[PDB]
Ligand binder design. Structure first.
Ligand SMILES: *[C@@H]1O[C@H](CO)[C@@H](O)[C@H](O)[C@H]1O[C@H]1C[C@](C)(N)[C@H](O)[C@H](C)O1
Ligand SMILES: [Cl-]
Length: 7
């Protein structure tokens, strides 16, 4: 998975 951004 992961995630991230930046928004
Ligand atoms: C975001 O993820 C990458 C992993 O590839 C790390 O290298 C990066 O340092 C990390 O960003 C940090 C710094 C930030 C953007 N302020 C946030 O705290 C994120 C969660 O962590
Ligand atoms: Cl991302």
């Amino acid at each position: 998975x992961x995630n991230x951004x930046y928004x």
